Amino acid sequence: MIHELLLALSGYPGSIFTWNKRSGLQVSQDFPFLHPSETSVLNRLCRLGTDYIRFTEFIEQYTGHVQQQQGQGGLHGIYLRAFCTGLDSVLQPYRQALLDLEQEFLGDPHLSISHVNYFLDQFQLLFPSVMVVVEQIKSQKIHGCQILETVYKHSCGGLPPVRSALEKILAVCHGVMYKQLSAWM
Amino acid sequence: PDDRSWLEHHVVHQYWTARPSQFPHSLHLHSNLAAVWDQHLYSSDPLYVPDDRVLVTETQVIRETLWLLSGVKKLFIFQLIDGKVTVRNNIIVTHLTHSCLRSVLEQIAAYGQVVFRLQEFIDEVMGPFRTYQAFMWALYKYFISFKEELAEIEKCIINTTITLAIVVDKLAPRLSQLKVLHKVFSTGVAETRNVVRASHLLNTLYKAILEYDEQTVSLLFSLWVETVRPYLQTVDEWIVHGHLWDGAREFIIQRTMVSFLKPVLKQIIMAGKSMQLLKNLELDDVHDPLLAITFELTLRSCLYPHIDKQYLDCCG
Amino acid sequence: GHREEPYLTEAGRDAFDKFCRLHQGELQLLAGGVLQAPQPVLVKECELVKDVLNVLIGVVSATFSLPESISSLLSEVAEYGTCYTRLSHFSLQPKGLVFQAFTSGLRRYLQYYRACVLSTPPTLSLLTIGFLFKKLGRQLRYLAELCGVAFPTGVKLLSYLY
């Protein structure tokens, strides 16, 4: 149940947390050896893994799916690929954290699930926060330069980790514009 | 057998599912007090239908409490009544007379409601204003340090001996600091416009620091600085960028009136506008080192030379 | 004393194995005895890690033919070697002269992919593999879309790549 959660969380959903796409991860259900006290902590941790699997799926989906042949900048288009490029390297500390968790579980196996929860709760706010930006881009068919303002309006807020995390992505998608401007000028 | 017995050994899950647990111990009155009290009742002729208590051990009840107290919700013991934790009445260990028990768990449950409501405030933020987010971020920075100690205690239940009278005294410097939040937040949860909703919230904190002008004051101070962060950004931005830009009058100044910046507000407006007429032809990174080198009284009057000199620069 | 005795939030590596064994037994009962599972461990962790490192060389193990969550990690890292082989046999020649230069240029990357595995790791954890060979293994799979595995060749292929 312990190791299984880490494997599910990295993007390998187990036979305990069964991945559907209309509902994400789901526990197998009430059994007489389990009761809600651990269950709720597990569910709260499973939220972040739902989001993470969606992220990896989208980044994979829009980078490396054509040998590059219209008017499309949202099913295709260099800016979308630039966002997908930024997003995974911003997601690097999550992977680093999961890697850490396996080592701590190896050192002493009796460590609690709340032990996992408090370490991962620096991410518990930031992971809903970055989701609305990608959701905006996907839903409203935001393409070309318009992606920059979509990220930029939420990189003028009042939470430091959200600001830095979005800042790295905006550097990348600035980079494609700079590469075109550096020759055209 | 073969799975149920091996479970019964390793896993604890039997005092709240089928075959309620029976605890053999040292007997004779010094910790056999519950059974003596039951026999006393039975001699005293109720007479029939004994009191339903399912017999959970104590050290466990400590674990379930610490889980509830840390801030994760939805445990089977301690039912809700409207979202409020209340004591469950099947608990008995082998003593504690079941009445002092029902009071002491109620007291700690009352402290659990205080943190429950704050986590509820936050849980409805994950399913803009930008002051609410800074508020929640302050609460969390406190919360994680609180949860860490409890989480450490949970290992040490397996380890020594741990009992109620120890964990109550050990959590004394926290249960002091929770009571103030129950009063501060109770006016921060009681209210429409984003400018009165911001001023009324800032004003509670600004009042609470001058109220006691030492663990509570560090609490009020560190929640103070982490929530005035939007305002300071806007205060600098009106000056140096020569324009005002708000959410929807999300800034309490309008081109709704706290006294927090009143002794310099004129100098703010007369600088912010005067830059705009220059264009037509970092104060936060000062404030955060200011805390390193009276609180919100003389200290705030030492912030003001730095912004006064800047106004002087602009108008000149 | 008697030690509070491992909880679900608690102990792993033995209770974890016990738990997964029990859940598999639960599934087996809940069907009627008509669901059949393979071996629950294969065969260990570190031995399995060295086996999957050998899969990246280009030799797939004899457990493949053309815990239980191990399958989900395992398929993703397993398919990398099977497409590496699907590049190497379409690089076996000693026509298009520029096409032959193109094939040796493909070997310039395939040798790098064979060199990075088992010249770096002493031993790594199981999840380190799936994270580490993500930026590289997906990049390896990108080249299969490039190749046919007709198929334009010669100046036609050279000019498209230009």
Residues making up chain B, counted from first to last? 316
CB burial of A43-69 (b: ≥16 within 10 Å; e: otherwise) equals bbbbebbbbbbbbbebbeebbeeeeee
> Where does residue B53 fall: left (phi above 0), alpha (psi -120 to 50 degrees), or beta otherwise?
beta
For residues C68 and A14, is the Cβ–Cβ distance under 8 A? yes
What is the rounded CA–CA span in Å between residue A141 and residue A106?
46
Please report where in the chains the tokens 């399958």 appear, as a residue.
C71
Residue with tokens 């299969």: C144
Helix locations, A23-154, DSSP H: 36-62, 78-90, 92-107, 113-120, 126-139, 146-154
Structure token pair of residue A109: 């196996």
| Structure tokens belonging to residue B16 | 């709240």
Question: Residue for token digits 């004591």?
Answer: B87
CB proximity C46 to A under 8 Å: no
Q: Rounded to 10 degrees, what is the CA torsion of A148, A153, A159, A163?
A: 20
Short-list A134, A141, A129, A45, CA closest to A87: A134
**How far apart are the two ends of chain A, measured CA to CA in Å?**
59
Q: Cα separation of A148 and A73, whole Å?
A: 13
The answer to whether A4 touches A16, Cβ cutoff 8 Å, is yes
Most B CBs within 10 A among A37, A117, A122, hence the mutation to make, goes to A37
3-state secondary structure at position A24: strand
Q: Is A21 part of the contact surface with chain B (CB cutoff 8 Å)? A: no
Q: Which two tokens stand for residue C116?
A: 């990075």
Contact check, Cβ <8 Å, A128/B75: no
3-state SS, B215-242, equals CHHHHHHHHHHCCCHHHHHHHHHHHHCC
Alpha carbon separation from B71 to A176, B139, B187, C123 (Å, rounded): 44, 12, 22, 39
Residue C128 to residue A99: CA distance in whole angstroms: 7
If one counts every other C-beta atom within 10 angstroms of the C-beta of residue A96, the result is 10
Report phi then psi at A24, rounded to 5.
75, -135
Q: Which residues is chain C interrupted after (C–N above 2.5 Å)? A: 66, 94, 149
Cα torsion C67, C73, C79, C81: sign: negative
Rounded to whole angstroms, the Cα distance separating C143 from C147 reads: 6
Token pair for B280: 């037509």
The set of residues, in sequence order, having a beta carbon less than 8 Å from that of C41 and lying 6+ positions away, is C67, C70
Q: Collapse the DSSP code of A20 into the 3-class scheme (helix H, G, I; strand E, B; otherwise coil) and give the result.
A: strand
* Placement of tokens 């909703």 in the chain: B197
Contacts of A149 (CB under 8 A, 6+ apart): none
What residues contact B144, with CB distance under 8 A and at least 6 apart?
A118, A121, A122
Among B10, B60, B157, whose Cβ lies nearest the Cβ of C6?
B10
Residues of B in contact with C18 (CB under 8 A): 6, 10
Q: Is the dihedral of CA B26, B30, B33, B35 positive or negative?
A: positive
Which residues on chain B are in Cβ contact (under 8 Å) with A34?
13
- Rounded to whole angstroms, how far apart are CA atoms A44 and C42? 31
Question: What is d(CA A127, CA A49) in angstroms, rounded to the nearest whole number?
Answer: 10
Place of tokens 């964990």: B167
User: Do residue A10 and residue C20 have CB atoms under 8 angstroms apart?
Assistant: no
Please provide the distance, in angstroms rounded to a whole number, between the alpha carbons at the two ends of chain C. 77
With tokens 């896993």, the residue in question is: B11
Task: Check CB contact of C4 with chain A, cutoff 8 Å.
Answer: no
Which whole-number Å values give the CA distances from A173 to A152, A169, A177, B38, B101, in the listed order?
Answer: 11, 6, 7, 74, 62
Q: Resolution in angstroms for this experimental structure? A: 8.1
Query: Are the beta carbons of A48 and A127 closer than 8 angstroms?
Result: yes
Amino acid identity for residue B178 in this structure: L
**What 3-state DSSP class applies to A121?**
coil
3 state SS of A86: helix
Q: Which amino acid is at C19?
A: F
Q: Tell me which residue of B65, B70, B66, B69 sits closest to B88, measured CA to CA.
A: B65
The residue length of chain A stands at 185
> Which of A35, A40, A122 lies nearest to residue B72, judging by beta carbons?
A40
- Interhelix angle B58-70/B100-123, nearest 10 degrees: 30
Within an 8 Å CB–CB cutoff, is residue A177 touching chain B?
no
Residue B289 tokens, joined:
């080192």
Task: Let me know: does A166 contact A155? Beta carbons within 8 Å.
Answer: yes
Half-sphere exposure of C161 (CA within 13 A, CB side): 14
- Way it was determined: cryo-EM
Q: Decide if C138 and A64 are in contact by the 8 Å CB cutoff.
A: yes
Residue B262 carries which DSSP code? G
Q: Which of C17, C22, C72 to probe by mutation at the A interface, max A CB count within 10 Å? A: C72
**Token pair recorded at residue A41:** 């902590």
What residues are paired with A24 via a beta bridge? A20
What distance in Å separates the CA atoms of residue B240 and residue B232, rounded to the nearest whole number? 13
For B9-37, b/e burial (b = at least 16 CB within 10 A) is: ebbbbbbbeeeeeeeeeeeeeeeeebeeb
CB contact under 8 A, B75 and A157: no
Q: What's the angle, vertex CA A27, arms to CA A110 and CA A59, rounded to 5?
A: 95
**CA–CA dist B8, A43 (Å, integer):** 26
Closest C-alpha among A166, A150, A152, A172 to residue A78: A172
Write the DSSP string, B63-107.
HHHHHHHHT----SSS--SSS-----TT---SSSTTTHHHHHHHH
Write the CA distances from A167 to A154, A180, B178, integer angstroms.
10, 20, 36
Show the tokens assigned to C128. 């380190």
Which residues in chain B precede a discontinuity of more than 2.5 Å between C and N?
A: 127, 159, 191, 213, 255, 281, 293
Residue A16 neighbours by CB distance under 10 Å: 20
Residue written as token pair 């057998």: B1
- Chain C residues whose CB is inside 8 A of the B5 CB are none
Locate A158 and state its tokens.
Answer: 């009042």
Residues in chain C: 162
User: What does B170-230 look like in DSSP terms, one character per residue?
Assistant: HTHHHHHHHHHHHHHHHHHS----TTHHHHHHHHHHHHHHHHT---HHHHHHHHHHTTSHH
Nearest-CA neighbor of B70 among B185, B182, B150, B184?
B150
